[PDB]
Amino acid sequence: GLECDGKVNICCKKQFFVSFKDIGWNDWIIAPSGYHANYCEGECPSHIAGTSGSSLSFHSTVINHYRMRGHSPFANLKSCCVPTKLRPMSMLYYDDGQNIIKKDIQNMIVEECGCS
Amino acid sequence: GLECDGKVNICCKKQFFVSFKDIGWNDWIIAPSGYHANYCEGECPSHSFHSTVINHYRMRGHSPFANLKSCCVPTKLRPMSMLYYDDGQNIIKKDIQNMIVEECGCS
Ligand SMILES: CCC[C@]1(C)C(=O)Nc2ccccc2C(=O)N1C
Known part of the structure:
Protein backbone atom coordinates (compact mmCIF):
# COMPACT_ATOMS: atom_id res chain seq x y z
CA GLY A 1 0.00 0.00 0.00
CA LEU A 2 0.76 3.71 0.03
CA GLU A 3 2.83 5.51 2.73
CA CYS A 4 2.01 9.16 3.51
CA ASP A 5 4.44 11.88 2.23
CA GLY A 6 4.54 15.46 1.02
CA LYS A 7 1.52 16.20 -1.24
CA VAL A 8 -0.07 12.65 -0.86
CA ASN A 9 -3.79 13.48 -0.35
CA ILE A 10 -5.34 9.99 -0.69
CA CYS A 11 -5.58 6.95 1.68
CA CYS A 12 -2.10 6.19 3.09
CA ASP A 22 -0.95 7.76 27.96
CA ILE A 23 -4.12 5.64 27.88
CA GLY A 24 -3.64 4.19 31.41
CA TRP A 25 -3.21 0.56 30.27
CA ASN A 26 0.32 0.45 31.84
CA ASP A 27 -1.42 -0.71 35.08
CA TRP A 28 -1.71 -4.25 33.55
CA ILE A 29 0.58 -4.14 30.45
CA ILE A 30 4.17 -4.88 31.51
CA ALA A 31 5.87 -4.96 28.07
CA PRO A 32 6.34 -3.29 25.61
CA SER A 33 5.62 0.09 27.29
CA GLY A 34 4.92 1.63 23.89
CA TYR A 35 5.13 0.70 20.20
CA HIS A 36 4.83 1.85 16.54
CA ALA A 37 1.14 1.10 15.76
CA ASN A 38 0.77 3.21 12.53
CA TYR A 39 -2.64 4.33 11.16
CA CYS A 40 -4.55 4.91 7.97
CA GLU A 41 -5.85 8.24 6.82
CA GLY A 42 -6.69 10.05 3.59
CA GLU A 43 -9.25 10.54 0.82
CA CYS A 44 -10.92 7.56 -0.87
CA GLY A 53 -2.98 0.19 -2.83
CA SER A 54 -2.08 -1.16 -6.26
CA SER A 55 -4.30 -4.30 -5.77
CA LEU A 56 -8.04 -4.95 -6.21
CA SER A 57 -9.45 -8.11 -4.60
CA PHE A 58 -12.12 -10.33 -6.31
CA HIS A 59 -14.66 -9.20 -3.67
CA SER A 60 -13.87 -5.51 -4.34
CA THR A 61 -14.19 -6.16 -8.13
CA VAL A 62 -17.76 -7.52 -7.59
CA ILE A 63 -18.68 -4.46 -5.41
CA ASN A 64 -17.22 -2.02 -7.95
CA HIS A 65 -19.26 -3.79 -10.67
CA TYR A 66 -22.43 -2.64 -8.77
CA ARG A 67 -20.98 0.67 -7.63
CA MET A 68 -19.92 1.68 -11.23
CA ARG A 69 -23.50 1.00 -12.49
CA GLY A 70 -25.10 3.09 -9.72
CA HIS A 71 -26.77 0.10 -7.90
CA SER A 72 -27.97 0.74 -4.30
CA PRO A 73 -26.63 0.89 -1.55
CA PHE A 74 -23.10 0.54 -3.16
CA ALA A 75 -23.50 3.77 -5.22
CA ASN A 76 -24.21 5.89 -2.03
CA LEU A 77 -21.97 3.81 0.37
CA LYS A 78 -18.88 5.91 1.37
CA SER A 79 -15.36 4.44 0.94
CA CYS A 80 -13.09 4.68 4.03
CA CYS A 81 -9.28 4.53 4.47
CA VAL A 82 -8.79 1.53 6.72
CA PRO A 83 -6.09 -1.09 7.52
CA THR A 84 -6.06 -4.01 5.02
CA LYS A 85 -3.15 -5.91 6.61
CA LEU A 86 -2.23 -6.11 10.29
CA ARG A 87 0.63 -7.70 12.19
CA PRO A 88 0.70 -9.33 15.68
CA MET A 89 3.00 -8.31 18.56
CA SER A 90 4.42 -10.12 21.60
CA MET A 91 2.93 -8.70 24.80
CA LEU A 92 3.50 -9.31 28.56
CA TYR A 93 0.43 -8.45 30.63
CA TYR A 94 -1.68 -9.34 33.71
CA ASP A 95 -4.80 -11.34 32.63
CA ASP A 96 -8.11 -11.87 34.61
CA GLY A 97 -7.18 -15.59 34.74
CA GLN A 98 -4.97 -14.77 37.86
CA ASN A 99 -1.44 -14.62 36.10
CA ILE A 100 1.31 -12.75 34.05
CA ILE A 101 0.90 -13.86 30.39
CA LYS A 102 3.36 -13.70 27.44
CA LYS A 103 1.33 -13.85 24.18
CA ASP A 104 1.41 -12.79 20.52
CA ILE A 105 -1.61 -10.45 20.34
CA GLN A 106 -3.15 -10.31 16.84
CA ASN A 107 -3.97 -7.07 14.92
CA MET A 108 -1.65 -4.72 16.81
CA ILE A 109 0.35 -3.10 13.98
CA VAL A 110 -0.98 -1.63 10.73
CA GLU A 111 1.14 -2.95 7.82
CA GLU A 112 -1.08 -1.71 4.87
CA CYS A 113 -3.95 0.77 4.23
CA GLY A 114 -6.68 0.63 1.60
CA CYS A 115 -10.11 1.93 0.65
CA SER A 116 -13.25 0.02 1.69
CA GLY B 1 -19.82 -10.20 14.20
CA LEU B 2 -23.41 -9.04 13.73
CA GLU B 3 -25.69 -10.12 10.83
CA CYS B 4 -28.18 -7.64 9.35
CA ASP B 5 -31.98 -7.98 9.59
CA GLY B 6 -34.35 -5.03 9.10
CA LYS B 7 -34.05 -4.41 12.87
CA VAL B 8 -30.42 -3.88 13.95
CA ASN B 9 -29.16 -0.35 12.90
CA ILE B 10 -25.45 -0.75 13.85
CA CYS B 11 -22.57 -2.15 11.66
CA CYS B 12 -23.60 -5.58 10.34
CA ASP B 22 -26.28 -11.91 -14.36
CA ILE B 23 -23.11 -9.78 -14.56
CA GLY B 24 -21.73 -11.56 -17.64
CA TRP B 25 -18.62 -13.01 -15.95
CA ASN B 26 -19.80 -16.57 -16.85
CA ASP B 27 -17.81 -16.37 -20.17
CA TRP B 28 -14.58 -16.95 -18.14
CA ILE B 29 -15.86 -18.35 -14.78
CA ILE B 30 -16.93 -22.03 -15.04
CA ALA B 31 -17.64 -22.79 -11.36
CA PRO B 32 -19.28 -21.91 -8.99
CA SER B 33 -22.13 -20.35 -11.00
CA GLY B 34 -22.92 -18.01 -8.09
CA TYR B 35 -21.86 -17.20 -4.53
CA HIS B 36 -22.72 -15.09 -1.45
CA ALA B 37 -20.19 -12.27 -1.55
CA ASN B 38 -21.92 -10.22 1.22
CA TYR B 39 -21.12 -6.68 2.33
CA CYS B 40 -20.94 -4.38 5.45
CA GLU B 41 -23.45 -1.66 6.32
CA GLY B 42 -24.50 0.24 9.48
CA GLU B 43 -23.74 3.02 11.99
CA CYS B 44 -20.48 3.02 13.97
CA SER B 48 -9.57 -5.40 16.43
CA PHE B 49 -7.08 -4.49 19.18
CA HIS B 50 -5.63 -1.73 16.93
CA SER B 51 -9.19 -0.17 16.49
CA THR B 52 -9.70 -0.34 20.31
CA VAL B 53 -6.44 1.64 20.91
CA ILE B 54 -7.70 4.21 18.29
CA ASN B 55 -11.08 4.47 20.06
CA HIS B 56 -9.43 4.76 23.51
CA TYR B 57 -7.55 7.77 21.97
CA ARG B 58 -10.67 9.12 20.00
CA MET B 59 -12.66 9.10 23.33
CA ARG B 60 -10.23 11.72 24.83
CA GLY B 61 -9.72 14.94 22.80
CA HIS B 62 -6.72 13.65 20.75
CA SER B 63 -6.39 15.75 17.49
CA PRO B 64 -5.95 13.07 14.69
CA PHE B 65 -8.53 10.51 15.99
CA ALA B 66 -11.06 13.02 17.43
CA ASN B 67 -11.99 14.03 13.82
CA LEU B 68 -11.47 10.46 12.40
CA LYS B 69 -14.85 8.77 11.74
CA SER B 70 -15.35 5.01 12.38
CA CYS B 71 -16.51 2.97 9.31
CA CYS B 72 -18.38 -0.35 8.94
CA VAL B 73 -15.91 -2.54 7.03
CA PRO B 74 -15.06 -6.28 6.57
CA THR B 75 -12.91 -7.68 9.43
CA LYS B 76 -12.73 -11.24 8.06
CA LEU B 77 -12.69 -12.49 4.47
CA ARG B 78 -12.73 -16.11 3.30
CA PRO B 79 -11.23 -17.66 0.13
CA MET B 80 -13.27 -19.77 -2.35
CA SER B 81 -12.39 -22.53 -4.84
CA MET B 82 -12.92 -21.27 -8.40
CA LEU B 83 -12.71 -22.88 -11.87
CA TYR B 84 -12.00 -20.33 -14.60
CA TYR B 85 -10.41 -19.78 -18.05
CA ASP B 86 -7.05 -18.00 -17.87
CA ASP B 87 -5.06 -15.80 -20.38
CA GLY B 88 -4.61 -18.67 -22.92
CA GLN B 89 -8.03 -20.45 -22.51
CA ASN B 90 -6.49 -22.96 -20.00
CA ILE B 91 -8.86 -24.12 -17.26
CA ILE B 92 -7.54 -23.32 -13.75
CA LYS B 93 -8.78 -24.63 -10.37
CA LYS B 94 -7.63 -22.24 -7.61
CA ASP B 95 -8.59 -21.04 -4.11
CA ILE B 96 -9.09 -17.31 -4.72
CA GLN B 97 -8.39 -15.19 -1.60
CA ASN B 98 -10.74 -12.44 -0.23
CA MET B 99 -13.89 -13.62 -2.02
CA ILE B 100 -16.45 -13.71 0.77
CA VAL B 101 -17.07 -11.13 3.52
CA GLU B 102 -17.42 -13.36 6.68
CA GLU B 103 -17.51 -10.63 9.40
CA CYS B 104 -18.08 -6.84 9.67
CA GLY B 105 -16.76 -4.41 12.26
CA CYS B 106 -16.06 -0.77 13.00
CA SER B 107 -12.69 0.81 12.12
C1 LIG C 1 -4.44 -4.58 23.00
C2 LIG C 1 -5.23 -5.58 23.81
C3 LIG C 1 -4.35 -6.61 24.49
C4 LIG C 1 -4.96 -7.38 25.69
C5 LIG C 1 -3.95 -8.51 25.88
C6 LIG C 1 -6.28 -8.10 25.36
O1 LIG C 1 -6.29 -9.10 24.65
N1 LIG C 1 -7.44 -7.64 25.88
C7 LIG C 1 -7.92 -6.31 25.92
C8 LIG C 1 -9.17 -6.07 25.34
C9 LIG C 1 -9.68 -4.78 25.30
C10 LIG C 1 -8.97 -3.72 25.84
C11 LIG C 1 -7.73 -3.94 26.42
C12 LIG C 1 -7.19 -5.23 26.47
C13 LIG C 1 -5.80 -5.33 27.02
O2 LIG C 1 -5.26 -4.34 27.50
N2 LIG C 1 -5.16 -6.52 27.00
C14 LIG C 1 -4.92 -7.19 28.28
Missing part, protein backbone atom coordinates in the same frame (compact mmCIF):
# COMPACT_ATOMS: atom_id res chain seq x y z
CA LYS A 13 -0.16 4.79 6.08
CA LYS A 14 1.41 7.14 8.69
CA GLN A 15 3.04 6.83 12.15
CA PHE A 16 1.10 6.40 15.33
CA PHE A 17 3.08 5.90 18.49
CA VAL A 18 1.03 4.18 21.20
CA SER A 19 2.17 4.78 24.76
CA PHE A 20 0.27 2.51 27.19
CA LYS A 21 1.00 5.10 29.99
CA PRO A 45 -12.33 8.90 -4.22
CA SER A 46 -14.39 6.62 -6.49
CA HIS A 47 -11.44 5.87 -8.81
CA ILE A 48 -9.70 4.13 -5.81
CA ALA A 49 -12.75 2.84 -3.84
CA GLY A 50 -12.20 -0.85 -2.75
CA THR A 51 -8.45 -0.90 -3.60
CA SER A 52 -5.61 -2.13 -1.38
CA LYS B 13 -23.02 -8.16 7.57
CA LYS B 14 -25.66 -7.87 4.84
CA GLN B 15 -26.20 -11.13 2.92
CA PHE B 16 -25.60 -10.65 -0.82
CA PHE B 17 -25.72 -13.26 -3.59
CA VAL B 18 -23.99 -12.70 -6.95
CA SER B 19 -24.83 -14.77 -10.08
CA PHE B 20 -21.92 -14.71 -12.57
CA LYS B 21 -24.43 -15.12 -15.48
CA PRO B 45 -21.11 5.04 17.21
CA SER B 46 -18.67 5.49 20.20
CA HIS B 47 -20.10 2.49 22.19
Whole structure:
Protein backbone atom coordinates (compact mmCIF):
# COMPACT_ATOMS: atom_id res chain seq x y z
CA GLY A 1 0.00 0.00 0.00
CA LEU A 2 0.76 3.71 0.03
CA GLU A 3 2.83 5.51 2.73
CA CYS A 4 2.01 9.16 3.51
CA ASP A 5 4.44 11.88 2.23
CA GLY A 6 4.54 15.46 1.02
CA LYS A 7 1.52 16.20 -1.24
CA VAL A 8 -0.07 12.65 -0.86
CA ASN A 9 -3.79 13.48 -0.35
CA ILE A 10 -5.34 9.99 -0.69
CA CYS A 11 -5.58 6.95 1.68
CA CYS A 12 -2.10 6.19 3.09
CA LYS A 13 -0.16 4.79 6.08
CA LYS A 14 1.41 7.14 8.69
CA GLN A 15 3.04 6.83 12.15
CA PHE A 16 1.10 6.40 15.33
CA PHE A 17 3.08 5.90 18.49
CA VAL A 18 1.03 4.18 21.20
CA SER A 19 2.17 4.78 24.76
CA PHE A 20 0.27 2.51 27.19
CA LYS A 21 1.00 5.10 29.99
CA ASP A 22 -0.95 7.76 27.96
CA ILE A 23 -4.12 5.64 27.88
CA GLY A 24 -3.64 4.19 31.41
CA TRP A 25 -3.21 0.56 30.27
CA ASN A 26 0.32 0.45 31.84
CA ASP A 27 -1.42 -0.71 35.08
CA TRP A 28 -1.71 -4.25 33.55
CA ILE A 29 0.58 -4.14 30.45
CA ILE A 30 4.17 -4.88 31.51
CA ALA A 31 5.87 -4.96 28.07
CA PRO A 32 6.34 -3.29 25.61
CA SER A 33 5.62 0.09 27.29
CA GLY A 34 4.92 1.63 23.89
CA TYR A 35 5.13 0.70 20.20
CA HIS A 36 4.83 1.85 16.54
CA ALA A 37 1.14 1.10 15.76
CA ASN A 38 0.77 3.21 12.53
CA TYR A 39 -2.64 4.33 11.16
CA CYS A 40 -4.55 4.91 7.97
CA GLU A 41 -5.85 8.24 6.82
CA GLY A 42 -6.69 10.05 3.59
CA GLU A 43 -9.25 10.54 0.82
CA CYS A 44 -10.92 7.56 -0.87
CA PRO A 45 -12.33 8.90 -4.22
CA SER A 46 -14.39 6.62 -6.49
CA HIS A 47 -11.44 5.87 -8.81
CA ILE A 48 -9.70 4.13 -5.81
CA ALA A 49 -12.75 2.84 -3.84
CA GLY A 50 -12.20 -0.85 -2.75
CA THR A 51 -8.45 -0.90 -3.60
CA SER A 52 -5.61 -2.13 -1.38
CA GLY A 53 -2.98 0.19 -2.83
CA SER A 54 -2.08 -1.16 -6.26
CA SER A 55 -4.30 -4.30 -5.77
CA LEU A 56 -8.04 -4.95 -6.21
CA SER A 57 -9.45 -8.11 -4.60
CA PHE A 58 -12.12 -10.33 -6.31
CA HIS A 59 -14.66 -9.20 -3.67
CA SER A 60 -13.87 -5.51 -4.34
CA THR A 61 -14.19 -6.16 -8.13
CA VAL A 62 -17.76 -7.52 -7.59
CA ILE A 63 -18.68 -4.46 -5.41
CA ASN A 64 -17.22 -2.02 -7.95
CA HIS A 65 -19.26 -3.79 -10.67
CA TYR A 66 -22.43 -2.64 -8.77
CA ARG A 67 -20.98 0.67 -7.63
CA MET A 68 -19.92 1.68 -11.23
CA ARG A 69 -23.50 1.00 -12.49
CA GLY A 70 -25.10 3.09 -9.72
CA HIS A 71 -26.77 0.10 -7.90
CA SER A 72 -27.97 0.74 -4.30
CA PRO A 73 -26.63 0.89 -1.55
CA PHE A 74 -23.10 0.54 -3.16
CA ALA A 75 -23.50 3.77 -5.22
CA ASN A 76 -24.21 5.89 -2.03
CA LEU A 77 -21.97 3.81 0.37
CA LYS A 78 -18.88 5.91 1.37
CA SER A 79 -15.36 4.44 0.94
CA CYS A 80 -13.09 4.68 4.03
CA CYS A 81 -9.28 4.53 4.47
CA VAL A 82 -8.79 1.53 6.72
CA PRO A 83 -6.09 -1.09 7.52
CA THR A 84 -6.06 -4.01 5.02
CA LYS A 85 -3.15 -5.91 6.61
CA LEU A 86 -2.23 -6.11 10.29
CA ARG A 87 0.63 -7.70 12.19
CA PRO A 88 0.70 -9.33 15.68
CA MET A 89 3.00 -8.31 18.56
CA SER A 90 4.42 -10.12 21.60
CA MET A 91 2.93 -8.70 24.80
CA LEU A 92 3.50 -9.31 28.56
CA TYR A 93 0.43 -8.45 30.63
CA TYR A 94 -1.68 -9.34 33.71
CA ASP A 95 -4.80 -11.34 32.63
CA ASP A 96 -8.11 -11.87 34.61
CA GLY A 97 -7.18 -15.59 34.74
CA GLN A 98 -4.97 -14.77 37.86
CA ASN A 99 -1.44 -14.62 36.10
CA ILE A 100 1.31 -12.75 34.05
CA ILE A 101 0.90 -13.86 30.39
CA LYS A 102 3.36 -13.70 27.44
CA LYS A 103 1.33 -13.85 24.18
CA ASP A 104 1.41 -12.79 20.52
CA ILE A 105 -1.61 -10.45 20.34
CA GLN A 106 -3.15 -10.31 16.84
CA ASN A 107 -3.97 -7.07 14.92
CA MET A 108 -1.65 -4.72 16.81
CA ILE A 109 0.35 -3.10 13.98
CA VAL A 110 -0.98 -1.63 10.73
CA GLU A 111 1.14 -2.95 7.82
CA GLU A 112 -1.08 -1.71 4.87
CA CYS A 113 -3.95 0.77 4.23
CA GLY A 114 -6.68 0.63 1.60
CA CYS A 115 -10.11 1.93 0.65
CA SER A 116 -13.25 0.02 1.69
CA GLY B 1 -19.82 -10.20 14.20
CA LEU B 2 -23.41 -9.04 13.73
CA GLU B 3 -25.69 -10.12 10.83
CA CYS B 4 -28.18 -7.64 9.35
CA ASP B 5 -31.98 -7.98 9.59
CA GLY B 6 -34.35 -5.03 9.10
CA LYS B 7 -34.05 -4.41 12.87
CA VAL B 8 -30.42 -3.88 13.95
CA ASN B 9 -29.16 -0.35 12.90
CA ILE B 10 -25.45 -0.75 13.85
CA CYS B 11 -22.57 -2.15 11.66
CA CYS B 12 -23.60 -5.58 10.34
CA LYS B 13 -23.02 -8.16 7.57
CA LYS B 14 -25.66 -7.87 4.84
CA GLN B 15 -26.20 -11.13 2.92
CA PHE B 16 -25.60 -10.65 -0.82
CA PHE B 17 -25.72 -13.26 -3.59
CA VAL B 18 -23.99 -12.70 -6.95
CA SER B 19 -24.83 -14.77 -10.08
CA PHE B 20 -21.92 -14.71 -12.57
CA LYS B 21 -24.43 -15.12 -15.48
CA ASP B 22 -26.28 -11.91 -14.36
CA ILE B 23 -23.11 -9.78 -14.56
CA GLY B 24 -21.73 -11.56 -17.64
CA TRP B 25 -18.62 -13.01 -15.95
CA ASN B 26 -19.80 -16.57 -16.85
CA ASP B 27 -17.81 -16.37 -20.17
CA TRP B 28 -14.58 -16.95 -18.14
CA ILE B 29 -15.86 -18.35 -14.78
CA ILE B 30 -16.93 -22.03 -15.04
CA ALA B 31 -17.64 -22.79 -11.36
CA PRO B 32 -19.28 -21.91 -8.99
CA SER B 33 -22.13 -20.35 -11.00
CA GLY B 34 -22.92 -18.01 -8.09
CA TYR B 35 -21.86 -17.20 -4.53
CA HIS B 36 -22.72 -15.09 -1.45
CA ALA B 37 -20.19 -12.27 -1.55
CA ASN B 38 -21.92 -10.22 1.22
CA TYR B 39 -21.12 -6.68 2.33
CA CYS B 40 -20.94 -4.38 5.45
CA GLU B 41 -23.45 -1.66 6.32
CA GLY B 42 -24.50 0.24 9.48
CA GLU B 43 -23.74 3.02 11.99
CA CYS B 44 -20.48 3.02 13.97
CA PRO B 45 -21.11 5.04 17.21
CA SER B 46 -18.67 5.49 20.20
CA HIS B 47 -20.10 2.49 22.19
CA SER B 48 -9.57 -5.40 16.43
CA PHE B 49 -7.08 -4.49 19.18
CA HIS B 50 -5.63 -1.73 16.93
CA SER B 51 -9.19 -0.17 16.49
CA THR B 52 -9.70 -0.34 20.31
CA VAL B 53 -6.44 1.64 20.91
CA ILE B 54 -7.70 4.21 18.29
CA ASN B 55 -11.08 4.47 20.06
CA HIS B 56 -9.43 4.76 23.51
CA TYR B 57 -7.55 7.77 21.97
CA ARG B 58 -10.67 9.12 20.00
CA MET B 59 -12.66 9.10 23.33
CA ARG B 60 -10.23 11.72 24.83
CA GLY B 61 -9.72 14.94 22.80
CA HIS B 62 -6.72 13.65 20.75
CA SER B 63 -6.39 15.75 17.49
CA PRO B 64 -5.95 13.07 14.69
CA PHE B 65 -8.53 10.51 15.99
CA ALA B 66 -11.06 13.02 17.43
CA ASN B 67 -11.99 14.03 13.82
CA LEU B 68 -11.47 10.46 12.40
CA LYS B 69 -14.85 8.77 11.74
CA SER B 70 -15.35 5.01 12.38
CA CYS B 71 -16.51 2.97 9.31
CA CYS B 72 -18.38 -0.35 8.94
CA VAL B 73 -15.91 -2.54 7.03
CA PRO B 74 -15.06 -6.28 6.57
CA THR B 75 -12.91 -7.68 9.43
CA LYS B 76 -12.73 -11.24 8.06
CA LEU B 77 -12.69 -12.49 4.47
CA ARG B 78 -12.73 -16.11 3.30
CA PRO B 79 -11.23 -17.66 0.13
CA MET B 80 -13.27 -19.77 -2.35
CA SER B 81 -12.39 -22.53 -4.84
CA MET B 82 -12.92 -21.27 -8.40
CA LEU B 83 -12.71 -22.88 -11.87
CA TYR B 84 -12.00 -20.33 -14.60
CA TYR B 85 -10.41 -19.78 -18.05
CA ASP B 86 -7.05 -18.00 -17.87
CA ASP B 87 -5.06 -15.80 -20.38
CA GLY B 88 -4.61 -18.67 -22.92
CA GLN B 89 -8.03 -20.45 -22.51
CA ASN B 90 -6.49 -22.96 -20.00
CA ILE B 91 -8.86 -24.12 -17.26
CA ILE B 92 -7.54 -23.32 -13.75
CA LYS B 93 -8.78 -24.63 -10.37
CA LYS B 94 -7.63 -22.24 -7.61
CA ASP B 95 -8.59 -21.04 -4.11
CA ILE B 96 -9.09 -17.31 -4.72
CA GLN B 97 -8.39 -15.19 -1.60
CA ASN B 98 -10.74 -12.44 -0.23
CA MET B 99 -13.89 -13.62 -2.02
CA ILE B 100 -16.45 -13.71 0.77
CA VAL B 101 -17.07 -11.13 3.52
CA GLU B 102 -17.42 -13.36 6.68
CA GLU B 103 -17.51 -10.63 9.40
CA CYS B 104 -18.08 -6.84 9.67
CA GLY B 105 -16.76 -4.41 12.26
CA CYS B 106 -16.06 -0.77 13.00
CA SER B 107 -12.69 0.81 12.12
C1 LIG C 1 -4.44 -4.58 23.00
C2 LIG C 1 -5.23 -5.58 23.81
C3 LIG C 1 -4.35 -6.61 24.49
C4 LIG C 1 -4.96 -7.38 25.69
C5 LIG C 1 -3.95 -8.51 25.88
C6 LIG C 1 -6.28 -8.10 25.36
O1 LIG C 1 -6.29 -9.10 24.65
N1 LIG C 1 -7.44 -7.64 25.88
C7 LIG C 1 -7.92 -6.31 25.92
C8 LIG C 1 -9.17 -6.07 25.34
C9 LIG C 1 -9.68 -4.78 25.30
C10 LIG C 1 -8.97 -3.72 25.84
C11 LIG C 1 -7.73 -3.94 26.42
C12 LIG C 1 -7.19 -5.23 26.47
C13 LIG C 1 -5.80 -5.33 27.02
O2 LIG C 1 -5.26 -4.34 27.50
N2 LIG C 1 -5.16 -6.52 27.00
C14 LIG C 1 -4.92 -7.19 28.28
